[PDB]
Amino acid sequence: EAPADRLKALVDAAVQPVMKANDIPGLAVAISLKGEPHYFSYGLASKEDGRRVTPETLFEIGSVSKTFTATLAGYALTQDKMRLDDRASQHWPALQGSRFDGISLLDLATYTAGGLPLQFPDSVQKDQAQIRDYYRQWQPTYAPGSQRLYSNPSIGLFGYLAARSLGQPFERLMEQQVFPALGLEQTHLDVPEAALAQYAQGYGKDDRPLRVGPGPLDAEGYGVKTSAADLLRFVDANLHPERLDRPWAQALDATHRGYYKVGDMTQGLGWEAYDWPISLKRLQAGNSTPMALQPHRIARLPAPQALEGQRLLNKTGSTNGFGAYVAFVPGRDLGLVILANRNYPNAERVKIAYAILSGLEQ
Ligand SMILES: *C(=O)[C@@H]1[C@H](NS(=O)(=O)O)CCN1C(=O)N[C@H]1CCCNCC1
Ligand SMILES: [Cl-]
């Protein structure tokens, strides 16, 4: 019983102090190790009705959704419906004559379009015309392809245009094609009524209840609600794309290609990669507020780099009431998911993950 005992002891030791310190009501861990899933569930999905977290509890994953968006784009790309060097306006006539004539799909996907902001301004509602108008009027702060500024409207437009290239709405493609191709039956953009009992409550300041509301390009940027078990299934698809039908294998591979570096981080479609091993402090810095909020000059690669082998691929994501983190090591067939119903600092999420990964190495 030693191995099961040791894994429980390790995950408990990593998770419990961080949950206490960040007053996290409920937290789900899922780990893929040596080809088997392992689940560890903590606390409450809802403090008020006493629903406990399980591996089936649905959490908002926020920007981790971008890795799903990237997978749909990978499908469009490897199906020859778009190319990364296409100008954005090729895929939406509304953008012809705008600055998007001079901005590539790759620029949008990797946040280098020239200063698209972190979020849509509050003045832009979930409305196709308002979104249209927003992009039509937007002007770059600096040359496209030169600086990374992490941005929902940037990758949101990338996903929206990938959907246009496939001739169907983004949301429909996700529900009808992407999630089924990945074997995901507990993963939603719009949680069905019959599944609402599984949907955790989110918690903010003074423990106010917070579930995510509608916003422009929400599906593309931050729309996914999923369970720890389903998100680990997605990690396993990423660890083994060859286990999927060829078109989807290629779609996943397209999210494992790096285009430039900023500091220790290599930017793919959705996924962000680090050499492994690397220090906890460096991994935290790559997932820090200044990394997200400030423009960084890029070091472009001479050719796309395979994000595999001795690397850690990760993504953080948050909503007002939730905080998610996913990390995997391709060359070790190892992955983990940490989902919580409080938006707690990225550094703390990474701290839990690092403690688990370090302990599995020891
Ligand atoms: C993604 O989660 C982005 C950003 N990602 S990061 O943690 O990698 O920097 C953190 C917040 N964020 C959002 O998408 N925020 C949305 C949260 C939903 C409520 N308003 C829309 C903004
Ligand atoms: Cl936004």
Side-chain angles (χ1 to χ4, degrees), residues 1-19 21-51 53-82 84-204 207 209-296 298-361:
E1 305 176 32
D5 283 351
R6 289 193 304 267
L7 187 61
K8 173 180 158 62
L10 169 67
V11 178
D12 287 353
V15 168
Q16 294 182 136
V18 179
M19 280 187 85
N22 293 276
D23 196 26
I24 301 172
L27 186 152
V29 175
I31 299 161
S32 182
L33 172 66
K34 296 170 70 170
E36 303 177 298
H38 305 262
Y39 309 115
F40 300 90
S41 303
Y42 302 85
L44 299 177
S46 166
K47 297 179 72 166
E48 286 81 15
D49 66 36
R51 278 179 288 126
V53 171
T54 76
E56 287 75 51
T57 300
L58 301 171
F59 291 85
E60 297 170 7
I61 69 176
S63 291
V64 181
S65 302
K66 295 172 185 180
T67 63
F68 288 98
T69 303
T71 304
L72 175 66
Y75 183 73
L77 280 166
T78 56
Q79 295 287 114
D80 307 316
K81 292 281 191 276
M82 62 179 230
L84 285 171
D85 57 7
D86 287 352
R87 296 302 167 84
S89 62
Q90 171 186 154
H91 296 283
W92 194 9
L95 301 184
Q96 283 185 246
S98 80
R99 298 298 295 273
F100 291 94
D101 285 342
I103 295 168
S104 74
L105 292 181
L106 182 61
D107 288 327
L108 292 173
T110 64
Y111 323 111
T112 60
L116 279 167
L118 176 72
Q119 296 172 194
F120 277 102
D122 298 334
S123 65
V124 179
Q125 302 178 300
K126 186 177 171 66
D127 179 81
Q128 212 266 358
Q130 291 187 42
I131 293 163
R132 169 201 75 206
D133 286 350
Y134 172 79
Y135 289 120
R136 283 192 58 68
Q137 66 75 49
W138 179 83
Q139 304 186 7
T141 307
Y142 25 76
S146 73
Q147 309 215 34
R148 179 184 192 272
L149 184 67
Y150 184 80
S151 170
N152 281 359
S154 188
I155 193 162
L157 184 57
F158 178 65
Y160 180 73
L161 297 179
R164 292 191 59 95
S165 84
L166 288 159
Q168 294 194 52
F170 180 87
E171 295 86 343
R172 189 202 296 159
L173 288 162
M174 302 303 306
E175 294 184 348
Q176 298 290 283
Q177 290 199 252
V178 180
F179 298 154
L182 299 165
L184 306 179
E185 296 173 18
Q186 303 168 206
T187 298
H188 315 281
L189 296 169
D190 193 353
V191 179
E193 283 190 316
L196 286 175
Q198 298 279 196
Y199 195 166
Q201 188 62 80
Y203 294 96
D207 286 354
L210 295 169
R211 282 184 182 167
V212 69
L217 305 187
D218 52 359
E220 292 86 346
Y222 57 88
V224 176
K225 297 90 200 176
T226 191
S227 64
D230 254 25
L231 196 52
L232 195 72
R233 287 171 185 110
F234 180 57
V235 171
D236 282 323
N238 272 270
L239 288 168
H240 291 282
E242 77 280 354
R243 292 177 188 168
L244 291 83
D245 295 316
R246 196 159 295 263
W248 295 100
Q250 293 172 158
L252 291 157
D253 282 340
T255 75
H256 304 160
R257 300 190 171 121
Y259 295 95
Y260 65 72
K261 295 183 196 296
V262 170
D264 294 316
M265 188 276 289
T266 302
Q267 182 69 65
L269 306 181
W271 299 109
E272 297 172 21
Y274 298 82
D275 294 337
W276 192 247
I278 196 164
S279 73
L280 173 56
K281 286 180 181 175
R282 283 180 180 276
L283 188 58
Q284 289 172 319
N287 290 291
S288 69
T289 298
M291 183 59 172
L293 296 188
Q294 301 169 197
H296 294 245
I298 70 165
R300 207 180 327 263
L301 299 168
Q305 187 160 35
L307 306 178
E308 65 192 4
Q310 299 173 263
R311 285 184 172 81
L312 184 141
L313 277 63
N314 76 356
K315 188 70 185 82
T316 50
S318 300
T319 58
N320 293 148
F322 289 82
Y325 182 63
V326 174
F328 63 98
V329 183
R332 297 283 175 267
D333 196 13
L334 176 68
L336 67 77
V337 162
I338 306 166
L339 303 179
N341 63 355
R342 190 182 299 286
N343 179 2
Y344 68 114
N346 285 349
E348 299 285 299
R349 312 180 195 181
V350 177
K351 185 190 283 189
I352 297 175
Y354 201 95
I356 294 171
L357 299 167
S358 290
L360 291 170
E361 190 157 48

Short mmCIF file of all heavy atoms in Angstrom, two decimals, residues 75-129, unseen atoms left out:
data_model
loop_
_atom_site.label_atom_id
_atom_site.label_comp_id
_atom_site.label_asym_id
_atom_site.label_seq_id
_atom_site.Cartn_x
_atom_site.Cartn_y
_atom_site.Cartn_z
N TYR A 75 -6.91 22.29 -35.77
CA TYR A 75 -7.74 21.53 -36.70
C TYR A 75 -7.94 22.31 -38.00
O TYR A 75 -7.70 21.77 -39.07
CB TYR A 75 -9.07 21.17 -36.04
CG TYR A 75 -9.98 20.32 -36.90
CD1 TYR A 75 -9.69 18.98 -37.12
CD2 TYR A 75 -11.13 20.87 -37.46
CE1 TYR A 75 -10.53 18.20 -37.91
CE2 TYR A 75 -11.98 20.09 -38.25
CZ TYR A 75 -11.66 18.76 -38.46
OH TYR A 75 -12.50 17.99 -39.25
N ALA A 76 -8.33 23.58 -37.91
CA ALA A 76 -8.48 24.40 -39.12
C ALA A 76 -7.19 24.45 -39.94
O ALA A 76 -7.23 24.35 -41.17
CB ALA A 76 -8.95 25.81 -38.76
N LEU A 77 -6.05 24.56 -39.25
CA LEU A 77 -4.73 24.71 -39.89
C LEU A 77 -4.30 23.48 -40.64
O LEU A 77 -3.83 23.57 -41.78
CB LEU A 77 -3.66 25.01 -38.83
CG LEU A 77 -3.52 26.43 -38.31
CD1 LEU A 77 -2.65 26.44 -37.05
CD2 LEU A 77 -2.97 27.37 -39.37
N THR A 78 -4.43 22.32 -39.99
CA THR A 78 -3.93 21.07 -40.55
C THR A 78 -4.93 20.50 -41.57
O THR A 78 -4.61 19.57 -42.32
CB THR A 78 -3.56 20.06 -39.44
OG1 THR A 78 -4.68 19.83 -38.58
CG2 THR A 78 -2.37 20.59 -38.61
N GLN A 79 -6.13 21.09 -41.59
CA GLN A 79 -7.15 20.86 -42.63
C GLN A 79 -7.08 21.85 -43.81
O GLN A 79 -7.95 21.82 -44.68
CB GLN A 79 -8.55 20.91 -42.02
CG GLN A 79 -8.86 19.80 -41.01
CD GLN A 79 -9.05 18.45 -41.65
OE1 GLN A 79 -8.25 17.54 -41.45
NE2 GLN A 79 -10.11 18.32 -42.45
N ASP A 80 -6.08 22.73 -43.82
CA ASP A 80 -5.84 23.69 -44.92
C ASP A 80 -6.95 24.73 -45.14
O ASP A 80 -7.14 25.23 -46.26
CB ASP A 80 -5.55 22.94 -46.24
CG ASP A 80 -4.43 21.93 -46.10
OD1 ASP A 80 -3.40 22.25 -45.48
OD2 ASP A 80 -4.58 20.81 -46.64
N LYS A 81 -7.67 25.07 -44.07
CA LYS A 81 -8.72 26.09 -44.13
C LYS A 81 -8.16 27.48 -43.78
O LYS A 81 -8.79 28.50 -44.06
CB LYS A 81 -9.85 25.73 -43.16
CG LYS A 81 -10.66 24.49 -43.58
CD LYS A 81 -11.67 24.85 -44.67
CE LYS A 81 -12.66 23.71 -44.91
NZ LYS A 81 -12.12 22.68 -45.85
N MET A 82 -6.98 27.48 -43.17
CA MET A 82 -6.25 28.70 -42.83
C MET A 82 -4.77 28.36 -42.69
O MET A 82 -4.40 27.18 -42.54
CB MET A 82 -6.79 29.33 -41.54
CG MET A 82 -6.66 28.45 -40.31
SD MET A 82 -7.29 29.28 -38.84
CE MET A 82 -5.96 29.06 -37.66
N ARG A 83 -3.93 29.39 -42.78
CA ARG A 83 -2.51 29.29 -42.50
C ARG A 83 -2.15 30.33 -41.44
O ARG A 83 -2.79 31.38 -41.34
CB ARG A 83 -1.69 29.56 -43.76
CG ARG A 83 -1.82 28.50 -44.84
CD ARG A 83 -1.24 29.00 -46.15
NE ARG A 83 0.19 29.29 -46.02
N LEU A 84 -1.12 30.04 -40.65
CA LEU A 84 -0.69 30.96 -39.59
C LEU A 84 -0.22 32.30 -40.14
O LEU A 84 -0.34 33.32 -39.46
CB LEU A 84 0.37 30.30 -38.69
CG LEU A 84 -0.18 29.27 -37.71
CD1 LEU A 84 0.95 28.52 -37.03
CD2 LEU A 84 -1.10 29.93 -36.67
N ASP A 85 0.28 32.32 -41.37
CA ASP A 85 0.72 33.56 -42.01
C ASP A 85 -0.38 34.32 -42.79
O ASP A 85 -0.09 35.36 -43.41
CB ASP A 85 1.98 33.34 -42.87
CG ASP A 85 1.80 32.29 -43.95
OD1 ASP A 85 0.68 31.79 -44.16
OD2 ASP A 85 2.82 31.95 -44.59
N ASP A 86 -1.61 33.81 -42.77
CA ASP A 86 -2.75 34.53 -43.34
C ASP A 86 -2.92 35.85 -42.60
O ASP A 86 -2.73 35.92 -41.38
CB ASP A 86 -4.04 33.74 -43.16
CG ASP A 86 -4.15 32.53 -44.07
OD1 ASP A 86 -3.30 32.36 -44.98
OD2 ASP A 86 -5.12 31.78 -43.87
N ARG A 87 -3.29 36.89 -43.33
CA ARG A 87 -3.70 38.13 -42.69
C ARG A 87 -5.08 37.92 -42.09
O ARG A 87 -5.90 37.22 -42.66
CB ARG A 87 -3.66 39.30 -43.67
CG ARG A 87 -2.25 39.59 -44.19
CD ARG A 87 -1.28 39.90 -43.03
NE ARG A 87 0.13 39.91 -43.43
CZ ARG A 87 0.77 40.94 -43.97
NH1 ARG A 87 0.12 42.08 -44.21
NH2 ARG A 87 2.05 40.84 -44.29
N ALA A 88 -5.31 38.51 -40.92
CA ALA A 88 -6.55 38.33 -40.19
C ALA A 88 -7.78 38.67 -41.04
O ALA A 88 -8.79 37.96 -41.00
CB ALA A 88 -6.54 39.15 -38.91
N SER A 89 -7.67 39.73 -41.84
CA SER A 89 -8.81 40.19 -42.63
C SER A 89 -9.19 39.24 -43.79
O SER A 89 -10.25 39.40 -44.38
CB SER A 89 -8.59 41.61 -43.13
OG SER A 89 -7.46 41.69 -43.98
N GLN A 90 -8.34 38.25 -44.09
CA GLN A 90 -8.71 37.20 -45.07
C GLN A 90 -9.96 36.44 -44.63
O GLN A 90 -10.69 35.91 -45.46
CB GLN A 90 -7.56 36.20 -45.27
CG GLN A 90 -7.99 34.97 -46.10
CD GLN A 90 -6.94 33.89 -46.23
OE1 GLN A 90 -7.27 32.71 -46.41
NE2 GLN A 90 -5.67 34.27 -46.15
N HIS A 91 -10.20 36.41 -43.32
CA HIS A 91 -11.20 35.51 -42.76
C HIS A 91 -12.46 36.18 -42.24
O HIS A 91 -13.36 35.50 -41.74
CB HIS A 91 -10.56 34.61 -41.71
CG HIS A 91 -9.51 33.70 -42.28
ND1 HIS A 91 -9.83 32.56 -42.99
CD2 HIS A 91 -8.16 33.80 -42.29
CE1 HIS A 91 -8.72 31.98 -43.39
NE2 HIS A 91 -7.69 32.71 -42.98
N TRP A 92 -12.53 37.50 -42.38
CA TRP A 92 -13.69 38.28 -41.96
C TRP A 92 -13.73 39.56 -42.79
O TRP A 92 -12.95 40.47 -42.54
CB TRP A 92 -13.60 38.58 -40.46
CG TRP A 92 -14.86 39.08 -39.82
CD1 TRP A 92 -16.11 39.13 -40.37
CD2 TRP A 92 -15.00 39.56 -38.48
NE1 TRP A 92 -17.01 39.62 -39.46
CE2 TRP A 92 -16.36 39.90 -38.29
CE3 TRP A 92 -14.10 39.74 -37.41
CZ2 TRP A 92 -16.85 40.40 -37.09
CZ3 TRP A 92 -14.59 40.25 -36.22
CH2 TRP A 92 -15.95 40.57 -36.06
N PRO A 93 -14.63 39.63 -43.79
CA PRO A 93 -14.70 40.80 -44.67
C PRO A 93 -14.86 42.12 -43.92
O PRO A 93 -14.34 43.15 -44.37
CB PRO A 93 -15.92 40.51 -45.55
CG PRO A 93 -15.99 39.01 -45.58
CD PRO A 93 -15.59 38.58 -44.20
N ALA A 94 -15.55 42.07 -42.78
CA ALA A 94 -15.73 43.24 -41.92
C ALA A 94 -14.40 43.90 -41.54
O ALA A 94 -14.36 45.10 -41.27
CB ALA A 94 -16.52 42.86 -40.68
N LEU A 95 -13.32 43.11 -41.52
CA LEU A 95 -11.99 43.62 -41.16
C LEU A 95 -11.16 44.13 -42.34
O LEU A 95 -10.09 44.72 -42.14
CB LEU A 95 -11.20 42.56 -40.38
CG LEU A 95 -11.80 42.04 -39.08
CD1 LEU A 95 -10.81 41.07 -38.42
CD2 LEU A 95 -12.17 43.18 -38.13
N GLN A 96 -11.62 43.90 -43.57
CA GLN A 96 -10.90 44.43 -44.73
C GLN A 96 -10.84 45.96 -44.68
O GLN A 96 -11.84 46.62 -44.40
CB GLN A 96 -11.55 43.95 -46.03
CG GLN A 96 -11.22 42.51 -46.37
CD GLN A 96 -11.76 42.09 -47.73
OE1 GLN A 96 -12.65 41.24 -47.81
NE2 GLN A 96 -11.24 42.70 -48.79
N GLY A 97 -9.65 46.50 -44.92
CA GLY A 97 -9.45 47.94 -44.85
C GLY A 97 -9.04 48.45 -43.47
O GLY A 97 -8.67 49.62 -43.32
N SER A 98 -9.11 47.58 -42.47
CA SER A 98 -8.64 47.92 -41.12
C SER A 98 -7.18 47.54 -40.95
O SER A 98 -6.53 47.02 -41.87
CB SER A 98 -9.49 47.20 -40.07
OG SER A 98 -9.06 45.85 -39.94
N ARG A 99 -6.64 47.79 -39.75
CA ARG A 99 -5.25 47.46 -39.46
C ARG A 99 -5.01 45.95 -39.46
O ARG A 99 -3.86 45.50 -39.53
CB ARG A 99 -4.80 48.11 -38.14
CG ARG A 99 -4.84 49.64 -38.16
CD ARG A 99 -3.90 50.24 -39.20
NE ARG A 99 -2.49 49.97 -38.91
CZ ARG A 99 -1.72 50.73 -38.13
NH1 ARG A 99 -2.21 51.83 -37.55
NH2 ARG A 99 -0.46 50.38 -37.92
N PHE A 100 -6.09 45.17 -39.43
CA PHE A 100 -5.99 43.72 -39.50
C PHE A 100 -5.63 43.18 -40.88
O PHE A 100 -5.40 41.98 -41.05
CB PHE A 100 -7.23 43.07 -38.87
CG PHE A 100 -7.28 43.28 -37.39
CD1 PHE A 100 -7.98 44.35 -36.84
CD2 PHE A 100 -6.55 42.45 -36.55
CE1 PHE A 100 -7.97 44.57 -35.47
CE2 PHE A 100 -6.53 42.66 -35.17
CZ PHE A 100 -7.26 43.73 -34.63
N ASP A 101 -5.52 44.08 -41.86
CA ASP A 101 -4.92 43.75 -43.15
C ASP A 101 -3.44 43.43 -42.96
O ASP A 101 -2.86 42.72 -43.79
CB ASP A 101 -5.02 44.92 -44.14
CG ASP A 101 -6.42 45.11 -44.71
OD1 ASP A 101 -7.25 44.18 -44.65
OD2 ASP A 101 -6.68 46.21 -45.25
N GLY A 102 -2.82 43.96 -41.91
CA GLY A 102 -1.37 43.83 -41.69
C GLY A 102 -0.97 43.03 -40.47
O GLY A 102 0.16 43.14 -39.99
N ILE A 103 -1.90 42.21 -39.99
CA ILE A 103 -1.71 41.42 -38.77
C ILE A 103 -2.00 39.96 -39.12
O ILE A 103 -3.04 39.66 -39.69
CB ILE A 103 -2.65 41.93 -37.64
CG1 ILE A 103 -2.24 43.36 -37.23
CG2 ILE A 103 -2.64 40.98 -36.43
CD1 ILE A 103 -3.24 44.05 -36.35
N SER A 104 -1.08 39.06 -38.79
CA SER A 104 -1.25 37.65 -39.11
C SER A 104 -2.07 36.90 -38.05
O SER A 104 -2.22 37.36 -36.91
CB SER A 104 0.11 36.98 -39.30
OG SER A 104 0.75 36.80 -38.05
N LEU A 105 -2.57 35.73 -38.43
CA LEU A 105 -3.22 34.85 -37.47
C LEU A 105 -2.26 34.44 -36.35
O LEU A 105 -2.66 34.38 -35.19
CB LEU A 105 -3.80 33.61 -38.16
CG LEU A 105 -4.99 33.88 -39.11
CD1 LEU A 105 -5.48 32.57 -39.69
CD2 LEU A 105 -6.14 34.61 -38.42
N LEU A 106 -1.00 34.20 -36.70
CA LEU A 106 0.00 33.88 -35.69
C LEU A 106 0.16 35.02 -34.68
O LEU A 106 0.26 34.76 -33.48
CB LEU A 106 1.36 33.54 -36.33
CG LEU A 106 2.47 33.15 -35.34
CD1 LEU A 106 2.09 31.90 -34.55
CD2 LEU A 106 3.78 32.94 -36.10
N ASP A 107 0.18 36.26 -35.17
CA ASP A 107 0.26 37.42 -34.28
C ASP A 107 -0.88 37.40 -33.27
O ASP A 107 -0.67 37.62 -32.08
CB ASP A 107 0.14 38.74 -35.07
CG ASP A 107 1.38 39.09 -35.88
OD1 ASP A 107 2.51 38.75 -35.46
OD2 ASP A 107 1.21 39.74 -36.94
N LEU A 108 -2.09 37.15 -33.75
CA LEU A 108 -3.25 37.10 -32.87
C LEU A 108 -3.14 35.97 -31.84
O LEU A 108 -3.37 36.17 -30.65
CB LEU A 108 -4.54 36.94 -33.68
CG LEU A 108 -4.95 38.13 -34.55
CD1 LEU A 108 -6.14 37.71 -35.39
CD2 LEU A 108 -5.31 39.33 -33.67
N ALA A 109 -2.78 34.78 -32.32
CA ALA A 109 -2.70 33.61 -31.47
C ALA A 109 -1.68 33.76 -30.34
O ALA A 109 -1.88 33.23 -29.26
CB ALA A 109 -2.33 32.39 -32.31
N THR A 110 -0.59 34.47 -30.62
CA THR A 110 0.54 34.55 -29.69
C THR A 110 0.74 35.95 -29.11
O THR A 110 1.79 36.26 -28.57
CB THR A 110 1.84 34.02 -30.34
OG1 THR A 110 2.21 34.86 -31.44
CG2 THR A 110 1.66 32.57 -30.79
N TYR A 111 -0.30 36.78 -29.22
CA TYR A 111 -0.37 38.05 -28.47
C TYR A 111 0.62 39.11 -28.95
O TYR A 111 1.03 39.97 -28.18
CB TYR A 111 -0.23 37.85 -26.94
CG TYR A 111 -0.87 36.60 -26.38
CD1 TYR A 111 -0.08 35.57 -25.89
CD2 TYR A 111 -2.26 36.47 -26.32
CE1 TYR A 111 -0.65 34.41 -25.37
CE2 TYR A 111 -2.84 35.30 -25.80
CZ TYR A 111 -2.03 34.28 -25.33
OH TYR A 111 -2.58 33.12 -24.82
N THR A 112 1.00 39.03 -30.22
CA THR A 112 1.98 39.96 -30.78
C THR A 112 1.41 40.86 -31.88
O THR A 112 2.16 41.40 -32.69
CB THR A 112 3.24 39.22 -31.32
OG1 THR A 112 2.85 38.29 -32.35
CG2 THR A 112 3.95 38.47 -30.19
N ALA A 113 0.09 41.05 -31.88
CA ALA A 113 -0.58 41.90 -32.89
C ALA A 113 -0.22 43.39 -32.76
O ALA A 113 -0.42 44.15 -33.71
CB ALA A 113 -2.09 41.71 -32.83
N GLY A 114 0.29 43.79 -31.60
CA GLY A 114 0.78 45.16 -31.41
C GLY A 114 0.03 45.92 -30.33
O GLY A 114 -0.26 47.10 -30.50
N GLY A 115 -0.29 45.24 -29.23
CA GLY A 115 -0.85 45.93 -28.07
C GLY A 115 -2.34 45.80 -27.85
O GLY A 115 -2.93 46.62 -27.14
N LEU A 116 -2.98 44.79 -28.45
CA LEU A 116 -4.35 44.47 -28.05
C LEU A 116 -4.33 44.24 -26.53
O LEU A 116 -3.42 43.58 -26.02
CB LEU A 116 -4.89 43.25 -28.80
CG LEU A 116 -5.42 43.53 -30.22
CD1 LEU A 116 -5.62 42.21 -30.94
CD2 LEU A 116 -6.73 44.33 -30.20
N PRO A 117 -5.30 44.83 -25.80
CA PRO A 117 -5.21 44.86 -24.34
C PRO A 117 -5.59 43.54 -23.69
O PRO A 117 -6.10 42.63 -24.36
CB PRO A 117 -6.22 45.95 -23.95
CG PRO A 117 -7.23 45.92 -25.05
CD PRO A 117 -6.48 45.55 -26.30
N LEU A 118 -5.36 43.44 -22.38
CA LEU A 118 -5.66 42.23 -21.64
C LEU A 118 -7.10 41.76 -21.84
O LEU A 118 -7.35 40.59 -22.13
CB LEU A 118 -5.39 42.45 -20.14
CG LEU A 118 -5.74 41.29 -19.21
CD1 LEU A 118 -4.76 40.13 -19.37
CD2 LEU A 118 -5.77 41.76 -17.76
N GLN A 119 -8.05 42.68 -21.68
CA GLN A 119 -9.46 42.37 -21.88
C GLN A 119 -10.07 43.38 -22.84
O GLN A 119 -9.52 44.46 -23.04
CB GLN A 119 -10.21 42.44 -20.55
CG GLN A 119 -9.76 41.41 -19.53
CD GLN A 119 -10.39 41.62 -18.16
OE1 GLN A 119 -9.95 41.05 -17.17
NE2 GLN A 119 -11.43 42.45 -18.11
N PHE A 120 -11.20 43.01 -23.42
CA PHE A 120 -12.04 43.97 -24.13
C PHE A 120 -12.38 45.08 -23.14
O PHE A 120 -12.59 44.79 -21.96
CB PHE A 120 -13.34 43.32 -24.58
CG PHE A 120 -13.23 42.54 -25.86
CD1 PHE A 120 -13.14 41.16 -25.83
CD2 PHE A 120 -13.24 43.20 -27.09
CE1 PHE A 120 -13.05 40.42 -27.02
CE2 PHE A 120 -13.15 42.47 -28.28
CZ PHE A 120 -13.06 41.08 -28.24
N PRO A 121 -12.43 46.34 -23.62
CA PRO A 121 -12.92 47.40 -22.73
C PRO A 121 -14.32 47.09 -22.24
O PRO A 121 -15.07 46.37 -22.92
CB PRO A 121 -12.95 48.65 -23.63
CG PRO A 121 -12.25 48.29 -24.88
CD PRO A 121 -12.19 46.80 -24.99
N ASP A 122 -14.68 47.62 -21.08
CA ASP A 122 -15.99 47.38 -20.49
C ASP A 122 -17.13 47.84 -21.40
O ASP A 122 -18.24 47.31 -21.31
CB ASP A 122 -16.09 48.05 -19.11
CG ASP A 122 -15.08 47.51 -18.10
OD1 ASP A 122 -14.64 46.34 -18.22
OD2 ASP A 122 -14.74 48.26 -17.16
N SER A 123 -16.83 48.79 -22.28
CA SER A 123 -17.79 49.35 -23.23
C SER A 123 -18.19 48.39 -24.37
O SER A 123 -19.16 48.64 -25.08
CB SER A 123 -17.26 50.66 -23.83
OG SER A 123 -16.09 50.44 -24.61
N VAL A 124 -17.42 47.32 -24.55
CA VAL A 124 -17.72 46.32 -25.58
C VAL A 124 -18.50 45.16 -24.97
O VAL A 124 -17.96 44.38 -24.17
CB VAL A 124 -16.44 45.79 -26.28
CG1 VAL A 124 -16.79 44.73 -27.34
CG2 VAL A 124 -15.66 46.93 -26.90
N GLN A 125 -19.76 45.05 -25.35
CA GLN A 125 -20.63 44.00 -24.85
C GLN A 125 -20.56 42.74 -25.72
O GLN A 125 -19.92 42.75 -26.78
CB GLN A 125 -22.07 44.53 -24.74
CG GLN A 125 -22.16 45.75 -23.83
CD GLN A 125 -23.55 46.33 -23.76
OE1 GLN A 125 -24.13 46.74 -24.77
NE2 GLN A 125 -24.11 46.36 -22.55
N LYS A 126 -21.20 41.67 -25.26
CA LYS A 126 -21.24 40.43 -26.04
C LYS A 126 -22.22 40.61 -27.19
O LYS A 126 -23.41 40.29 -27.08
CB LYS A 126 -21.59 39.21 -25.16
CG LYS A 126 -21.51 37.89 -25.89
CD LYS A 126 -21.80 36.70 -24.98
CE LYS A 126 -21.92 35.41 -25.76
NZ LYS A 126 -20.65 34.98 -26.41
N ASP A 127 -21.71 41.16 -28.29
CA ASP A 127 -22.53 41.61 -29.41
C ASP A 127 -21.62 41.64 -30.62
O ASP A 127 -20.58 42.31 -30.59
CB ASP A 127 -23.10 43.00 -29.12
CG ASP A 127 -23.93 43.54 -30.26
OD1 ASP A 127 -25.12 43.17 -30.37
OD2 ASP A 127 -23.40 44.34 -31.06
N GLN A 128 -22.01 40.94 -31.68
CA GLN A 128 -21.17 40.77 -32.86
C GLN A 128 -20.81 42.11 -33.52
O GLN A 128 -19.67 42.31 -33.93
CB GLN A 128 -21.85 39.82 -33.86
CG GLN A 128 -20.88 38.98 -34.68
CD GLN A 128 -20.54 39.61 -36.01
OE1 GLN A 128 -21.06 40.68 -36.37
NE2 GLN A 128 -19.68 38.95 -36.77
N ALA A 129 -21.79 43.01 -33.58
CA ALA A 129 -21.58 44.34 -34.16
C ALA A 129 -20.60 45.17 -33.34
O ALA A 129 -19.73 45.84 -33.89
CB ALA A 129 -22.90 45.06 -34.31
#
